Amino acid sequence: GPMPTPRQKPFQSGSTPLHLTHRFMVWNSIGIIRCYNDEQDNAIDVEFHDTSIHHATHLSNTLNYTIADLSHEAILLACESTDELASKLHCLHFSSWDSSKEWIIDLPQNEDIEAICLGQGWAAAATSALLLRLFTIGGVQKEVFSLAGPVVSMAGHGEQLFIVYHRGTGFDGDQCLGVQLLELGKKKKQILHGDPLPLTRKSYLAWIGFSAEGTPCYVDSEGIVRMLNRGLGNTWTPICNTREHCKGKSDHYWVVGIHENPQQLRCIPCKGSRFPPTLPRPAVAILSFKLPYCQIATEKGQMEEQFWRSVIFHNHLDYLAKNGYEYEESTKNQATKEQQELLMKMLALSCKLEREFRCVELADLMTQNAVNLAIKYASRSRKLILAQKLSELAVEKAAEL
Amino acid sequence: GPMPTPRQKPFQSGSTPLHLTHRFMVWNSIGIIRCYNDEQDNAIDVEFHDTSIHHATHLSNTLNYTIADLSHEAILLACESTDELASKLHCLHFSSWDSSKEWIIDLPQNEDIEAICLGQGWAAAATSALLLRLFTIGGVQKEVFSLAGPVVSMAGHGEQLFIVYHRGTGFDGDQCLGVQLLELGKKKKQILHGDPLPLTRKSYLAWIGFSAEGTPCYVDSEGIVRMLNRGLGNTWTPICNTREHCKGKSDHYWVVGIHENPQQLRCIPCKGSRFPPTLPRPAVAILSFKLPYCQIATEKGQMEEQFWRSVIFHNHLDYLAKNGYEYEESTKNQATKEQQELLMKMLALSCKLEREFRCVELADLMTQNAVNLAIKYASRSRKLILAQKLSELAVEKAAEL
Amino acid sequence: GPMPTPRQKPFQSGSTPLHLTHRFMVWNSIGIIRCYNDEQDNAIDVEFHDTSIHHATHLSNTLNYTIADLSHEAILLACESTDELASKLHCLHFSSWDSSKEWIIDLPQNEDIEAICLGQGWAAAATSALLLRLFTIGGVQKEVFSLAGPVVSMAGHGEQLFIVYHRGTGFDGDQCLGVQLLELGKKKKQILHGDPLPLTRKSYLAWIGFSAEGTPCYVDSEGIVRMLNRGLGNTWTPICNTREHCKGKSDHYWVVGIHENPQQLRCIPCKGSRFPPTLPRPAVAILSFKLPYCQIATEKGQMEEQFWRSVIFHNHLDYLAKNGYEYEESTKNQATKEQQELLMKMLALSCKLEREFRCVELADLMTQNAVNLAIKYASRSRKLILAQKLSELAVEKAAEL
């Protein structure tokens, strides 16, 4: 019969394989951590993206760390549970008010760290006992809970903690993963509470994290980037099949990060290997998103892609408004005006195509000012039926606005 | 040892398999869509149950429109991706006033289709890439999101969408199915977050859909009708073992529609098969539901079954009311009247049995007017302790209210 | 490679195996039910820990009941179906005011009860049709719905109904279990609606139930006790490792009850066996709960583990107050006082360690009135930056307040 797929070993997002004599511990927007290791010595460097965060710093890998993660508040490290020493979690809170910026924790006996991440104001790790441990940046042990399966990876941004694990057994080459998403805020909540994780056929998970604006996203082995549509009931929307940015199967991409505004994907181009060449220091490439949409060669399909790209990449403004962070409303005004002008162009093209019911549907998707301009567009060429029905739809909108 | 179950192939909701010269591609409450295919052409025939919806219509193409759906506003068809054509969706928005009396849209390369459905001004389709495509019925591309697994079937009604897919790996004949439901009104919501789908042991899903009053329902291969009981925090209540009816004289009762006002299952009696042949014209058998309540030979059990069947069906009126749609208060009043009468009559039966605690328990399920009538009955029958307990219940309810 | 596991058969909490001649059918906080079959008689003995509740009861086991549950309100019994007689549900509502304290129900033909449980005024039964049936404690049939898989066990407390089932097939020793937690109160809800249930590796589920204070809890075959953390988004927090408490690690404890205030784990030690013998009668041992924190022998570890233990246990006060159940305000006063004096001592230790950012992180959990004491403590010995930043924290808390 069909075989069960082997579960993929856990990874740190943006990292590189352990065995490389030089490797990148993690690529991230704050600063690049890299390591040299061989049969007789081992050392770690951190190379900050902006030196105003902190100057570049170097350490000897005294306790043989194998995992790490960075934020602009602190840098974390973690090691294996050796026979002489169980797994240790280490931190330099380099941005602290106090000079006692270093601290370390050692797990109970026969327990090993499998993943580690940072947010803002907290740290987190997932261990070999299917047990997740929260900490503060200064190393107070916060609450603890058990995971439903072995962890694949984890990430964080602000009060958001993202975990992905093996919810079950994969079959005939496909993996079987689930996702938890926790709010470590004023009220502890769990928007995703073990839901299944979509993946491309016979693929495996390759990268996770958040955009710089705090929206969760991930990439699988086929390069299809998916992002959490918070508008459509917290569901995973694809945003880029990165294979089309490649010259072919010769190339892969290793994501450094994603920016929801400006609409950018930042990654290392890699040839042959999925992970980049370890030396010399590679240069980061930047790519543009295009949502996978049908008939995209046509201008109407292209602007449909532009519209849904605009709203999906300004969902973060709604999330910022809800969570209480500072943001500028001019961004939402720009997004609404741009996507409503695009919707105006679609309505004009549909009107010229005589698909006036499609114009009324587009006007249902419109804001009131755009419906008024659509009524004027329907008045051009004297299409009175469409103009009357657009006016009626405007009245219906006014009844609720 | 244990054996993995093979995943079943997808089916369009309410359709026959492709292994016959003539098929029902969809049979809704609206009407029937047939397909006859041979070496000459593929002939699609639409027959409305009421011609006031629209007249009988016929299409014919070399394209094999392998998937179909029907609604009061429009007809919908779709065809698979071939070695030279990508998939295409086809529609006839017959109710329209513009030039959208026909519409065709492509889908990308390798975007093979499994199932499609219709909504109030909406349309939807599932892809072999595990992306759900959403559209307006006039034909704008709406949002896209990633499906958690291979979809087995799909359905729609109003502003709500119902999806069933393969959640994991089955074993020993059981199929590991998951269910997802979304609502797309003013606030876009996700009711079922990818939860498991109950099924009879070693059964396979045979039909899904909505009741005509707008709640999801489905039937498995053993003939067990189930529906999403939203009076129980959205759990699956079984309603009918269709193999019972007419002492199982027909080897199957191929469901085509469900109603609860009146209480009517619409189905086709099938002899020696799970589905009927498309010609000669099968007759619609109408069957009444029978919930699987215990000790059904007794008056007590029959009154219980009547009461709970009534309340699960007439709970839909409150759902329709609170979600902002039109509903009928006379039917709600009749439902309440029958429920109070059933509780009163079975209270009298339990009084005859001297099971006064059952009488108080039944009084908990009815209003203050019925409780006062029961108190006066208790006074007439000189059951003072029963009257006192009912009076204490009335005092507690009045203090709470 | 991996191999599928045999999904374990259903069980009942505090039972011992059916093959025994003389066994416990249930042992809980209420009392004990024993059953035996020998040449002298086939019978069931019910007895209560507090004899004021009800006298010891004895029943001839002619119908061969096999599953049982005990509550303050009633005794509930069930049997597997044989060929001539169906599976039957039997109840003794001894706390009733009417003389007809017994009632009996007979299930549909070849339907078979596989688990039962009791609650405040209701009873539940899970059957071989993957069907859960609700009854009033006086035997009126309440609502019916389909389970997502074969059950393993059930439990009830007040309005809460806790169900665990097989959501799938496990591999490589593990069991694939899902948890479903209903509330049957004034509005029907699902707190957990099929979430995966954590387990230790290669374990099986050994015990389920509620604390006396009404929080769901369970124990796996590796002796790890887990409780539902309602203050952390309804995740699962381990609260005790019974293996560390044993005289020798080959032996293990058999749980019968849980209490949060006082913190008690009620269990029976077993000499070389999974469960205790029925005679000579076991003695219930008390074990203290222990969160699995790191560096737990240090003063930091002692303080923080006690803090988190205290707060996760005193979540039940919040649940009771939110759902309208009465409670003594002295419990909340004592909980807040203990937590605050403890965290004041922890603040003193972090202050003397001169980690003032850790002090701010610790004091973030506190009320500003209590943070004023830490401000004065920082003023003592002139820890100026610590005093200033605790003052800023108090000002921010007052600004939010």
Swiss-Prot record, chains A, B, C:
The modification N6-acetyllysine is found at K249. It is found in: Nucleus, Nucleoplasm. Core replisome component that acts as a replication initiation factor. Binds directly to the CMG complex and functions as a hub to recruit additional proteins to the replication fork. Trimer. Interacts with the polymerase alpha catalytic subunit POLA1. Interacts with MCM10. Interacts with DNA2. Interacts with CDC45 and GINS2 subunit of GINS complex; these interactions associate WDHD1 with the CMG helicase complex. This is WD repeat and HMG-box DNA-binding protein 1. It comes from Homo sapiens. The lineage of its organism: Eukaryota, Metazoa, Chordata, Craniata, Vertebrata.
